[PDB]
């Protein structure tokens, strides 16, 4: 239900209930037939699917206890460390003990035992994770199968129908230019029906073509799609115009980290501020790494702020999804920001992102790159040489803990680098530099940023065309470009679209059923259109 955006001069279109009008359920037969009935996707990962399955569960006493447990576990994870024994024991009594009325029997008895014991010792935020998966293992059975036959899944099919409607020229309205670079420019845009504000990243087809950037543009879209993170820009819509390809991303107008680091006039800022940014970047990094995707482009300009002062990683073009167990090569990135193992063309994993985190913390505190000056005339090959053969030094601006984490992230050997061990990100989160940071609360948006930005305002002439247009394809014998345009423009992206519907409360308002125990007319089979 909560606001956020580039400022909104115009709200929901007042015909929006017509625009988003449910199809009659009889028009959903094709969806019903083709849809992959997959529990995690339909009942968890997809935000409206999860809401509707939860609505189904609350009609059944036997199912609802499982949902309540899952919610309690969510509460447990954000509980302060010193109260975890209390919260954990309450969940034990309430849920995992047979005498309780809200007892859930499908969590295995030896799982309960293991959990009891882990709780007896020092409790960790992840205490109930095994019980949680056990619960989902049960819900994806008969409960799922009953949900699929309910009116709440019928209603999911109706939402999916709306989700998949084409993007057209009437989908969006256009506001000012936000910025310029890369293949194109970025402007504010707004979905008319829902009123949600986004950033439209406009890549010029001519510039993609001359630079041979098709693969990079396609890679960007496809990684964006598959990562859903509070700390990485999300992709809501991907579509075509006559001259451009458009990515409708999370609007982050707070300015980028390059600006904020060098705006002070005394570059570098408070460690408390640096710490907060670093912690969120790390979460963003862990979310990418969960997809076994390495970002490989970490630099201050690719980190953007929102009007709230939270950050997101942007510009995923150089990111690569690595096959499980594989390693990749290739020397990509920005000068001064590339890790030794990238520079030496070795095979590498997630490791460069951690080196990149080191650069960012360093530059945030010192105000300068570790291996370069900002005003400096120096050749690329010299900056590279510094990165391989010299060690950075640390001024009085660094606390001991800051110097330590930077040195451990800026470890040149990737094997010994912080966060590159078996613990992965967890090793970095537990570092003394972060000792006061509860990352679970951070991931849940429960901690306030120490700094609120002036939202960026650029002056720019351009009214640039972001109106959707599907060009006629195949005009030339060579249709490679055209194939790439068709591949790219898949329209709305499921999860962000659904969250948009929820956040703007289009979901809450539109999602309604009959007066009491009845179907609404759009679900009434006896009266088709
Ligand atoms: N590539 C992106 O995701 C964005 C780039 N800009 C602006 O365009 C500049 C160059 O990309 C940035 O510094 C911002 O001013 C953005 N502004 C708002 N949201 C975004 N999601 C971006």
Short mmCIF file of C-alpha atoms and ligand atoms in Angstrom, two decimals:
data_model
loop_
_atom_site.label_atom_id
_atom_site.label_comp_id
_atom_site.label_asym_id
_atom_site.label_seq_id
_atom_site.Cartn_x
_atom_site.Cartn_y
_atom_site.Cartn_z
CA UNK A 1 0.00 0.00 0.00
CA UNK A 2 3.06 2.31 0.52
CA UNK A 3 4.20 5.18 -1.74
CA UNK A 4 7.57 5.77 -3.28
CA UNK A 5 8.56 7.10 -6.71
CA UNK A 6 9.93 10.03 -8.71
CA UNK A 7 7.25 12.20 -7.25
CA UNK A 8 3.79 11.75 -8.64
CA UNK A 9 2.01 14.67 -10.17
CA UNK A 10 -0.61 12.39 -11.73
CA UNK A 11 -2.24 9.46 -9.91
CA UNK A 12 -4.13 6.32 -10.97
CA UNK A 13 -6.12 6.85 -14.13
CA UNK A 14 -9.77 7.06 -13.08
CA UNK A 15 -10.80 4.45 -15.63
CA UNK A 16 -8.16 2.14 -14.12
CA UNK A 17 -10.76 -0.36 -12.87
CA UNK A 18 -11.82 -0.81 -16.51
CA UNK A 19 -8.24 -1.07 -17.77
CA UNK A 20 -7.48 -3.70 -15.15
CA UNK A 21 -10.97 -5.31 -15.39
CA UNK A 22 -10.81 -9.09 -14.83
CA UNK A 23 -11.54 -11.31 -17.81
CA UNK A 24 -14.50 -13.67 -17.31
CA UNK A 25 -13.10 -16.95 -15.99
CA UNK A 26 -14.22 -18.68 -19.19
CA UNK A 27 -11.63 -16.58 -21.06
CA UNK A 28 -8.87 -18.17 -18.90
CA UNK A 29 -9.13 -21.69 -20.36
CA UNK A 30 -5.90 -21.29 -22.37
CA UNK A 31 -3.99 -20.14 -19.27
CA UNK A 32 -5.45 -22.94 -17.18
CA UNK A 33 -4.22 -25.46 -19.78
CA UNK A 34 -0.72 -24.14 -20.42
CA UNK A 35 0.25 -22.98 -16.97
CA UNK A 36 3.03 -24.84 -15.15
CA UNK A 37 1.50 -25.89 -11.86
CA UNK A 38 4.52 -25.47 -9.71
CA UNK A 39 4.10 -24.78 -6.02
CA UNK A 40 7.08 -22.49 -5.27
CA UNK A 41 6.37 -20.32 -8.28
CA UNK A 42 2.60 -20.20 -8.02
CA UNK A 43 2.26 -20.12 -4.21
CA UNK A 44 5.48 -18.39 -3.03
CA UNK A 45 7.72 -16.63 -5.56
CA UNK A 46 4.86 -14.89 -7.41
CA UNK A 47 3.55 -12.19 -5.06
CA UNK A 48 -0.12 -12.36 -6.11
CA UNK A 49 0.02 -16.17 -6.23
CA UNK A 50 1.32 -16.17 -2.66
CA UNK A 51 -1.39 -13.76 -1.50
CA UNK A 52 -4.14 -15.85 -3.09
CA UNK A 53 -2.80 -19.15 -1.74
CA UNK A 54 -2.65 -17.53 1.69
CA UNK A 55 -6.25 -16.43 1.23
CA UNK A 56 -7.13 -20.04 0.38
CA UNK A 57 -5.29 -21.30 3.49
CA UNK A 58 -7.16 -18.97 5.83
CA UNK A 59 -10.46 -20.61 4.88
CA UNK A 60 -9.06 -23.83 6.32
CA UNK A 61 -8.16 -24.12 10.05
CA UNK A 62 -5.88 -27.08 9.36
CA UNK A 63 -3.92 -25.18 6.75
CA UNK A 64 -3.87 -21.76 8.43
CA UNK A 65 -1.70 -23.00 11.31
CA UNK A 66 1.08 -23.66 8.81
CA UNK A 67 0.88 -20.11 7.44
CA UNK A 68 0.99 -18.73 11.01
CA UNK A 69 4.11 -20.73 11.74
CA UNK A 70 5.78 -19.37 8.58
CA UNK A 71 4.88 -15.83 9.69
CA UNK A 72 6.26 -16.51 13.19
CA UNK A 73 9.49 -17.71 11.67
CA UNK A 74 9.63 -14.43 9.70
CA UNK A 75 9.27 -12.57 13.02
CA UNK A 76 11.93 -14.74 14.63
CA UNK A 77 14.50 -13.86 11.93
CA UNK A 78 14.27 -10.13 12.57
CA UNK A 79 14.17 -10.58 16.37
CA UNK A 80 17.18 -9.03 18.19
CA UNK A 81 19.94 -11.57 18.95
CA UNK A 82 19.49 -11.46 22.70
CA UNK A 83 15.78 -12.20 22.46
CA UNK A 84 16.12 -15.14 20.02
CA UNK A 85 15.98 -17.71 22.82
CA UNK A 86 12.61 -16.29 23.91
CA UNK A 87 11.07 -15.98 20.46
CA UNK A 88 12.36 -19.42 19.47
CA UNK A 89 10.97 -21.09 22.58
CA UNK A 90 7.56 -19.46 22.03
CA UNK A 91 7.45 -20.87 18.49
CA UNK A 92 8.43 -24.25 19.93
CA UNK A 93 5.58 -24.26 22.47
CA UNK A 94 2.99 -22.80 20.12
CA UNK A 95 3.65 -24.80 16.98
CA UNK A 96 6.05 -27.71 17.34
CA UNK A 97 4.43 -29.12 20.53
CA UNK A 98 1.53 -31.63 20.12
CA UNK A 99 -0.38 -30.31 23.16
CA UNK A 100 -0.86 -26.93 21.43
CA UNK A 101 -4.04 -26.27 19.38
CA UNK A 102 -2.01 -24.59 16.65
CA UNK A 103 0.34 -27.61 16.59
CA UNK A 104 1.51 -28.56 13.07
CA UNK A 105 2.00 -32.32 12.82
CA UNK A 106 3.61 -32.41 9.37
CA UNK A 107 6.89 -31.02 10.68
CA UNK A 108 8.82 -34.23 11.33
CA UNK A 109 9.51 -35.24 14.93
CA UNK A 110 13.27 -35.57 14.41
CA UNK A 111 13.28 -32.10 12.80
CA UNK A 112 11.56 -30.82 15.92
CA UNK A 113 14.19 -32.60 18.08
CA UNK A 114 17.13 -31.18 16.13
CA UNK A 115 15.52 -27.74 16.41
CA UNK A 116 14.99 -28.03 20.16
CA UNK A 117 18.66 -28.88 20.60
CA UNK A 118 19.93 -26.08 18.37
CA UNK A 119 17.79 -23.72 20.45
CA UNK A 120 19.24 -25.03 23.70
CA UNK A 121 22.66 -23.93 22.45
CA UNK A 122 23.26 -20.48 20.99
CA UNK A 123 20.33 -19.75 18.60
CA UNK A 124 20.93 -18.37 15.11
CA UNK A 125 18.57 -16.42 12.90
CA UNK A 126 18.26 -19.49 10.65
CA UNK A 127 17.09 -21.83 13.43
CA UNK A 128 13.71 -22.63 11.87
CA UNK A 129 14.78 -22.81 8.21
CA UNK A 130 14.62 -26.62 8.11
CA UNK A 131 11.19 -26.64 9.75
CA UNK A 132 10.05 -24.05 7.23
CA UNK A 133 11.08 -26.18 4.21
CA UNK A 134 9.36 -29.16 5.85
CA UNK A 135 6.18 -27.11 5.99
CA UNK A 136 6.43 -26.17 2.30
CA UNK A 137 7.08 -29.82 1.46
CA UNK A 138 3.68 -30.59 2.96
CA UNK A 139 1.81 -27.60 1.52
CA UNK A 140 2.99 -28.42 -2.02
CA UNK A 141 1.03 -31.67 -1.74
CA UNK A 142 -2.71 -31.97 -1.14
CA UNK A 143 -3.02 -28.32 0.06
CA UNK A 144 -1.60 -27.11 -3.26
CA UNK A 145 -3.84 -29.49 -5.16
CA UNK A 146 -6.89 -28.19 -3.32
CA UNK A 147 -5.80 -24.62 -3.96
CA UNK A 148 -5.55 -25.36 -7.71
CA UNK A 149 -9.22 -26.41 -7.65
CA UNK A 150 -10.42 -23.37 -5.70
CA UNK A 151 -11.86 -20.00 -6.66
CA UNK A 152 -8.66 -18.38 -5.39
CA UNK A 153 -6.65 -20.10 -8.15
CA UNK A 154 -9.39 -19.22 -10.62
CA UNK A 155 -8.74 -15.65 -9.51
CA UNK A 156 -4.99 -16.13 -9.95
CA UNK A 157 -5.65 -17.13 -13.55
CA UNK A 158 -7.54 -13.85 -13.95
CA UNK A 159 -4.58 -11.84 -12.60
CA UNK A 160 -2.18 -13.77 -14.88
CA UNK A 161 -4.43 -12.90 -17.79
CA UNK A 162 -4.01 -9.21 -16.95
CA UNK A 163 -0.28 -9.63 -16.30
CA UNK A 164 0.27 -10.99 -19.82
CA UNK A 165 -1.66 -8.33 -21.75
CA UNK A 166 0.54 -6.51 -24.26
CA UNK A 167 2.49 -3.40 -23.52
CA UNK A 168 1.19 -0.67 -25.83
CA UNK A 169 1.54 3.05 -26.43
CA UNK A 170 -1.15 3.72 -23.81
CA UNK A 171 0.58 1.80 -21.03
CA UNK A 172 2.84 4.61 -19.78
CA UNK A 173 3.10 8.35 -19.46
CA UNK A 174 6.39 10.27 -19.69
CA UNK A 175 8.08 12.68 -17.26
CA UNK A 176 11.50 14.40 -17.33
CA UNK A 177 14.88 12.97 -18.36
CA UNK A 178 16.61 11.45 -15.34
CA UNK A 179 20.05 11.00 -16.83
CA UNK A 180 22.06 10.08 -19.89
CA UNK A 181 24.68 7.47 -20.83
CA UNK A 182 25.56 3.96 -22.01
CA UNK A 183 23.40 3.07 -25.00
CA UNK A 184 20.98 5.89 -24.34
CA UNK A 185 19.18 7.88 -21.72
CA UNK A 186 16.90 7.42 -18.75
CA UNK A 187 13.63 9.22 -18.13
CA UNK A 188 10.87 9.03 -15.53
CA UNK A 189 7.72 7.24 -16.66
CA UNK A 190 4.52 6.13 -14.97
CA UNK A 191 2.13 3.26 -15.52
CA UNK A 192 -1.19 4.99 -16.22
CA UNK A 193 -3.52 2.42 -14.71
CA UNK A 194 -1.63 1.90 -11.46
CA UNK A 195 0.12 5.23 -11.07
CA UNK A 196 3.46 3.63 -10.11
CA UNK A 197 6.62 5.61 -11.06
CA UNK A 198 9.52 3.94 -12.84
CA UNK A 199 12.75 4.76 -14.64
CA UNK A 200 12.64 3.98 -18.37
CA UNK A 201 16.09 3.06 -19.63
CA UNK A 202 16.06 3.76 -23.38
CA UNK A 203 18.74 1.95 -25.40
CA UNK A 204 19.14 3.30 -28.91
CA UNK A 205 19.02 0.56 -31.51
CA UNK A 206 21.56 2.35 -33.73
CA UNK A 207 24.07 2.50 -30.87
CA UNK A 208 23.51 -1.12 -29.83
CA UNK A 209 24.11 -2.09 -33.44
CA UNK A 210 27.31 -0.14 -34.16
CA UNK A 211 28.85 -1.28 -30.83
CA UNK A 212 27.62 -4.87 -31.31
CA UNK A 213 25.93 -4.68 -27.90
CA UNK A 214 23.01 -7.02 -28.61
CA UNK A 215 24.39 -9.76 -26.35
CA UNK A 216 25.07 -7.30 -23.56
CA UNK A 217 21.60 -5.76 -23.79
CA UNK A 218 20.00 -9.18 -23.87
CA UNK A 219 22.15 -10.36 -20.97
CA UNK A 220 21.16 -7.31 -18.92
CA UNK A 221 17.45 -7.89 -19.47
CA UNK A 222 17.68 -11.60 -18.71
CA UNK A 223 19.69 -11.29 -15.48
CA UNK A 224 17.48 -8.42 -14.23
CA UNK A 225 14.44 -10.61 -14.76
CA UNK A 226 15.77 -13.52 -12.70
CA UNK A 227 16.97 -11.50 -9.70
CA UNK A 228 14.43 -10.11 -7.30
CA UNK A 229 16.24 -8.15 -4.71
CA UNK A 230 15.53 -5.12 -2.58
CA UNK A 231 19.14 -4.07 -3.38
CA UNK A 232 19.28 -4.56 -7.16
CA UNK A 233 17.12 -2.60 -9.62
CA UNK A 234 14.08 -4.65 -10.65
CA UNK A 235 12.75 -4.94 -14.21
CA UNK A 236 8.97 -4.46 -14.56
CA UNK A 237 8.64 -4.17 -18.40
CA UNK A 238 10.77 -4.83 -21.49
CA UNK A 239 9.50 -3.52 -24.81
CA UNK A 240 10.22 -2.15 -28.26
CA UNK A 241 9.94 1.29 -29.83
CA UNK A 242 10.78 2.29 -33.42
CA UNK A 243 14.26 3.57 -32.57
CA UNK A 244 14.91 2.01 -29.16
CA UNK A 245 14.59 -0.88 -26.70
CA UNK A 246 13.16 0.00 -23.25
CA UNK A 247 13.83 -1.42 -19.82
CA UNK A 248 11.41 -0.11 -17.21
CA UNK A 249 13.39 -0.33 -13.99
CA UNK A 250 13.02 0.69 -10.33
CA UNK A 251 13.24 4.48 -10.23
CA UNK A 252 16.24 5.43 -8.15
CA UNK A 253 16.51 9.22 -8.18
CA UNK A 254 18.62 9.87 -5.08
CA UNK A 255 21.80 10.28 -7.15
CA UNK A 256 24.68 7.79 -7.56
CA UNK A 257 27.57 7.01 -5.18
CA UNK A 258 30.20 8.71 -7.34
CA UNK A 259 28.27 11.97 -6.99
CA UNK A 260 27.62 11.51 -3.29
CA UNK A 261 31.25 10.63 -2.53
CA UNK A 262 32.60 13.65 -4.46
CA UNK A 263 29.76 16.14 -3.71
CA UNK A 264 30.87 16.78 -0.15
CA UNK A 265 33.78 18.95 -1.31
CA UNK A 266 35.58 16.92 1.29
CA UNK A 267 35.25 13.59 -0.56
CA UNK A 268 34.43 10.52 1.47
CA UNK A 269 31.84 10.51 4.20
CA UNK A 270 31.10 9.22 7.71
CA UNK A 271 31.96 5.58 8.29
CA UNK A 272 28.44 5.10 9.69
CA UNK A 273 27.13 6.23 6.34
CA UNK A 274 29.72 4.13 4.45
CA UNK A 275 28.86 1.15 6.61
CA UNK A 276 25.19 1.38 5.78
CA UNK A 277 25.78 1.58 2.03
CA UNK A 278 28.31 -1.25 2.16
CA UNK A 279 25.89 -3.45 4.05
CA UNK A 280 23.14 -2.98 1.48
CA UNK A 281 25.51 -3.45 -1.47
CA UNK A 282 26.56 -6.72 0.18
CA UNK A 283 22.97 -7.88 0.38
CA UNK A 284 22.53 -6.96 -3.27
CA UNK A 285 25.69 -8.94 -3.98
CA UNK A 286 24.51 -11.99 -2.05
CA UNK A 287 21.19 -11.94 -3.96
CA UNK A 288 23.02 -11.96 -7.30
CA UNK A 289 25.35 -14.70 -6.04
CA UNK A 290 22.36 -16.80 -5.06
CA UNK A 291 21.65 -16.93 -8.80
CA UNK A 292 25.36 -17.76 -9.21
CA UNK A 293 25.60 -14.49 -11.09
CA UNK A 294 28.73 -12.32 -10.70
CA UNK A 295 28.17 -8.61 -11.17
CA UNK A 296 31.76 -7.70 -12.24
CA UNK A 297 31.10 -3.95 -12.67
CA UNK A 298 31.06 -2.60 -9.04
CA UNK A 299 31.94 1.11 -9.08
CA UNK A 300 30.36 4.09 -7.27
CA UNK A 301 28.43 5.30 -10.35
CA UNK A 302 26.58 1.98 -10.67
CA UNK A 303 25.22 2.29 -7.13
CA UNK A 304 22.09 4.48 -7.01
CA UNK A 305 20.09 5.94 -4.10
CA UNK A 306 16.33 6.32 -3.77
CA UNK A 307 14.59 9.32 -2.14
CA UNK A 308 14.58 7.35 1.09
CA UNK A 309 18.35 6.99 1.12
CA UNK A 310 18.46 3.24 0.44
CA UNK A 311 20.66 1.96 -2.38
CA UNK A 312 20.48 -0.46 -5.31
CA UNK A 313 23.01 -1.96 -7.68
CA UNK A 314 22.17 -0.87 -11.25
CA UNK A 315 23.38 -1.56 -14.81
CA UNK A 316 23.67 -5.34 -14.86
CA UNK A 317 25.01 -5.46 -18.44
CA UNK A 318 28.45 -6.86 -17.52
CA UNK A 319 27.00 -9.41 -15.08
CA UNK A 320 27.23 -13.11 -15.97
CA UNK A 321 25.19 -16.07 -14.83
CA UNK A 322 27.75 -18.80 -14.21
CA UNK A 323 26.80 -22.45 -14.69
CA UNK A 324 26.80 -24.36 -11.37
CA UNK A 325 30.30 -25.59 -10.68
CA UNK A 326 31.82 -23.77 -13.63
CA UNK A 327 34.22 -20.87 -13.82
CA UNK A 328 34.32 -18.18 -16.50
CA UNK A 329 36.94 -15.87 -17.97
CA UNK A 330 37.27 -12.57 -19.75
CA UNK A 331 38.57 -9.21 -18.84
CA UNK A 332 35.67 -6.78 -18.41
CA UNK A 333 35.05 -3.84 -16.14
CA UNK A 334 36.24 -0.33 -15.48
CA UNK A 335 39.87 0.65 -14.92
CA UNK A 336 40.83 0.88 -11.25
CA UNK A 337 37.85 -1.33 -10.37
CA UNK A 338 39.01 -4.67 -11.83
CA UNK A 339 40.25 -7.51 -9.61
CA UNK A 340 43.72 -9.06 -10.10
CA UNK A 341 42.25 -12.37 -11.27
CA UNK A 342 40.21 -10.50 -13.88
CA UNK A 343 43.31 -8.56 -14.93
CA UNK A 344 45.36 -11.77 -15.27
CA UNK A 345 42.65 -13.46 -17.37
CA UNK A 346 42.36 -16.37 -14.98
CA UNK A 347 39.22 -18.41 -14.53
CA UNK A 348 37.16 -16.84 -11.76
CA UNK A 349 33.94 -17.27 -9.75
CA UNK A 350 32.01 -14.79 -7.65
CA UNK A 351 35.33 -13.46 -6.28
CA UNK A 352 35.65 -10.18 -8.24
CA UNK A 353 32.52 -8.80 -6.64
CA UNK A 354 34.21 -8.99 -3.23
CA UNK A 355 37.26 -7.12 -4.51
CA UNK A 356 34.72 -4.66 -5.87
CA UNK A 357 33.12 -4.31 -2.44
CA UNK A 358 36.57 -3.47 -1.09
CA UNK A 359 37.05 -0.70 -3.67
CA UNK A 360 33.68 0.78 -2.74
CA UNK A 361 34.20 0.78 1.00
CA UNK A 362 37.67 2.22 0.50
CA UNK A 363 36.53 4.93 -1.88
CA UNK A 364 33.54 5.76 0.33
CA UNK A 365 35.76 6.39 3.36
CA UNK A 366 38.87 7.90 1.73
CA UNK A 367 36.93 9.70 -0.98
CA UNK A 368 39.40 8.42 -3.57
CA UNK A 369 40.01 5.18 -5.47
CA UNK A 370 42.63 3.00 -3.71
CA UNK A 371 44.86 2.80 -6.79
CA UNK A 372 44.08 6.12 -8.54
CA UNK A 373 43.67 9.85 -8.02
CA UNK A 374 40.55 11.46 -9.48
CA UNK A 375 42.39 14.43 -11.05
CA UNK A 376 45.27 12.22 -12.11
CA UNK A 377 46.77 11.87 -15.58
CA UNK A 378 47.77 8.23 -15.66
CA UNK A 379 47.69 5.55 -18.33
CA UNK A 380 45.35 2.52 -18.00
CA UNK A 381 48.31 0.13 -18.01
CA UNK A 382 49.75 1.97 -15.01
CA UNK A 383 46.57 1.75 -12.94
CA UNK A 384 46.50 -1.98 -13.77
CA UNK A 385 50.12 -2.35 -12.65
CA UNK A 386 49.30 -0.63 -9.36
CA UNK A 387 46.47 -3.06 -8.74
CA UNK A 388 48.74 -6.06 -9.26
CA UNK A 389 51.98 -4.91 -7.69
CA UNK A 390 51.24 -2.29 -5.01
CA UNK A 391 49.30 -2.16 -1.78
CA UNK A 392 46.81 0.57 -0.98
CA UNK A 393 47.47 2.72 2.13
CA UNK A 394 45.05 3.90 4.77
CA UNK A 395 44.63 7.39 6.17
CA UNK A 396 43.32 8.47 9.57
CA UNK A 397 39.84 8.49 8.00
CA UNK A 398 39.75 4.73 8.56
CA UNK A 399 38.83 3.05 11.82
CA UNK A 400 40.74 -0.17 12.56
CA UNK A 401 37.72 -2.23 11.53
CA UNK A 402 37.31 -0.34 8.27
CA UNK A 403 41.00 -0.72 7.43
CA UNK A 404 40.73 -4.44 8.21
CA UNK A 405 37.66 -5.26 6.10
CA UNK A 406 39.06 -3.21 3.20
CA UNK A 407 42.38 -5.04 3.41
CA UNK A 408 40.66 -8.41 3.58
CA UNK A 409 38.37 -7.61 0.65
CA UNK A 410 41.31 -6.10 -1.25
CA UNK A 411 43.30 -9.28 -0.74
CA UNK A 412 44.88 -9.85 -4.15
CA UNK A 413 44.78 -13.66 -4.04
CA UNK A 414 41.09 -14.54 -4.58
CA UNK A 415 41.46 -17.81 -2.60
CA UNK A 416 42.27 -15.89 0.60
CA UNK A 417 39.91 -12.95 -0.07
CA UNK A 418 37.12 -12.21 2.44
CA UNK A 419 33.78 -13.74 1.42
CA UNK A 420 35.44 -16.08 -1.09
CA UNK A 421 35.61 -18.97 1.39
CA UNK A 422 33.00 -21.64 2.13
CA UNK A 423 31.01 -19.23 4.31
CA UNK A 424 30.61 -17.00 1.31
CA UNK A 425 28.82 -13.74 2.23
CA UNK A 426 28.23 -14.83 5.78
CA UNK A 427 31.98 -14.41 6.41
CA UNK A 428 31.71 -10.75 5.40
CA UNK A 429 28.55 -10.04 7.40
CA UNK A 430 30.17 -11.21 10.63
CA UNK A 431 33.24 -8.95 10.20
CA UNK A 432 33.95 -6.48 13.06
CA UNK A 433 33.30 -3.59 10.61
CA UNK A 434 29.64 -4.74 10.55
CA UNK A 435 29.40 -5.90 14.23
CA UNK A 436 26.53 -3.50 15.00
CA UNK A 437 24.54 -4.42 11.86
CA UNK A 438 21.61 -6.82 11.99
CA UNK A 439 21.50 -7.96 8.39
CA UNK A 440 18.12 -9.68 8.75
CA UNK A 441 16.60 -6.37 9.89
CA UNK A 442 18.46 -4.61 7.08
CA UNK A 443 17.07 -7.01 4.47
CA UNK A 444 13.60 -6.40 5.90
CA UNK A 445 13.89 -2.60 5.58
CA UNK A 446 13.72 -2.12 9.35
CA UNK A 447 16.77 0.16 9.66
CA UNK A 448 16.70 3.82 8.64
CA UNK A 449 19.39 5.20 6.33
CA UNK A 450 21.65 7.75 8.15
CA UNK A 451 21.52 10.08 5.12
CA UNK A 452 18.62 11.35 2.99
CA UNK A 453 19.61 12.79 -0.44
CA UNK A 454 18.43 15.74 -2.49
CA UNK A 455 16.67 13.85 -5.30
CA UNK A 456 18.59 14.34 -8.56
CA UNK A 457 17.36 16.99 -10.98
CA UNK A 458 18.88 17.21 -14.43
CA UNK A 459 18.08 19.80 -17.02
CA UNK A 460 17.55 18.23 -20.39
CA UNK A 461 15.87 19.40 -23.60
CA UNK A 462 15.01 15.98 -24.97
CA UNK A 463 11.51 14.67 -25.15
CA UNK A 464 12.50 11.24 -26.34
CA UNK A 465 10.11 8.68 -27.66
CA UNK A 466 9.37 5.84 -25.27
CA UNK A 467 6.04 4.91 -26.91
CA UNK A 468 5.80 1.16 -27.52
CA UNK A 469 5.82 0.21 -31.18
CA UNK A 470 6.28 -3.28 -32.60
CA UNK A 471 8.26 -2.75 -35.76
CA UNK A 472 7.54 -4.79 -38.86
CA UNK A 473 10.20 -7.55 -38.83
CA UNK A 474 11.91 -9.33 -41.77
CA UNK A 475 12.08 -6.37 -44.16
CA UNK A 476 15.66 -7.47 -44.88
CA UNK A 477 17.01 -10.92 -45.76
CA UNK A 478 19.20 -10.50 -42.64
CA UNK A 479 16.82 -10.50 -39.65
CA UNK A 480 19.35 -11.00 -36.79
CA UNK A 481 18.59 -7.51 -35.38
CA UNK A 482 14.86 -8.17 -35.67
CA UNK A 483 15.21 -11.53 -33.86
CA UNK A 484 17.05 -9.78 -31.05
CA UNK A 485 14.26 -7.14 -30.82
CA UNK A 486 11.65 -9.91 -30.62
CA UNK A 487 13.74 -11.81 -28.07
CA UNK A 488 14.15 -8.72 -25.87
CA UNK A 489 10.65 -7.37 -25.82
CA UNK A 490 8.65 -9.82 -23.71
CA UNK A 491 6.44 -7.21 -22.12
CA UNK A 492 5.60 -7.18 -18.45
CA UNK A 493 7.77 -9.09 -15.98
CA UNK A 494 5.72 -11.28 -13.64
CA UNK A 495 6.97 -10.67 -10.12
CA UNK A 496 7.55 -6.89 -10.30
CA UNK A 497 4.25 -6.44 -12.13
CA UNK A 498 2.48 -8.26 -9.33
CA UNK A 499 4.22 -6.27 -6.62
CA UNK A 500 3.27 -3.10 -8.56
CA UNK A 501 -0.35 -4.26 -8.41
CA UNK A 502 -0.07 -4.91 -4.67
CA UNK A 503 1.91 -1.77 -3.79
CA UNK A 504 -0.48 0.54 -5.62
CA UNK A 505 -3.40 -1.30 -3.97
CA UNK A 506 -4.88 -2.19 -7.34
CA UNK A 507 -4.73 -5.72 -5.98
CA UNK A 508 -6.52 -4.99 -2.70
CA UNK A 509 -9.32 -2.99 -4.35
CA UNK A 510 -9.92 -5.16 -7.40
CA UNK A 511 -9.54 -8.49 -5.68
CA UNK A 512 -12.97 -9.22 -4.32
CA UNK A 513 -15.50 -12.02 -4.34
CA UNK A 514 -19.28 -12.32 -3.91
CA UNK A 515 -21.33 -10.73 -1.10
CA UNK A 516 -20.93 -13.72 1.20
CA UNK A 517 -20.24 -17.30 0.26
CA UNK A 518 -20.65 -16.68 -3.45
CA UNK A 519 -18.62 -16.23 -6.60
CA UNK A 520 -18.51 -12.73 -8.08
CA UNK A 521 -19.94 -12.34 -11.63
CA UNK A 522 -16.50 -12.63 -13.29
CA UNK A 523 -16.14 -16.10 -11.71
CA UNK A 524 -19.72 -17.11 -12.40
CA UNK A 525 -19.70 -19.84 -15.04
CA UNK A 526 -23.47 -19.73 -15.52
CA UNK A 527 -23.27 -16.22 -17.02
CA UNK A 528 -20.50 -15.99 -19.68
CA UNK A 529 -19.84 -12.99 -21.98
N1 LIG B 1 20.87 2.82 -15.45
C1 LIG B 1 19.90 3.03 -14.36
O1 LIG B 1 19.41 2.08 -13.76
C2 LIG B 1 19.50 4.48 -13.98
C3 LIG B 1 20.28 5.51 -14.45
N2 LIG B 1 19.73 6.67 -14.01
C4 LIG B 1 20.24 8.04 -14.19
O2 LIG B 1 21.06 8.08 -15.34
C5 LIG B 1 22.45 8.29 -14.94
C6 LIG B 1 23.37 7.53 -15.86
O3 LIG B 1 22.95 6.18 -15.99
C7 LIG B 1 22.46 7.90 -13.48
O4 LIG B 1 23.56 8.42 -12.75
C8 LIG B 1 21.12 8.42 -13.00
O5 LIG B 1 21.14 9.83 -12.89
C9 LIG B 1 18.63 6.38 -13.22
N3 LIG B 1 17.75 7.19 -12.54
C10 LIG B 1 16.71 6.62 -11.84
N4 LIG B 1 16.57 5.25 -11.84
C11 LIG B 1 17.43 4.46 -12.51
N5 LIG B 1 16.84 3.18 -12.19
C12 LIG B 1 18.48 5.03 -13.22
#
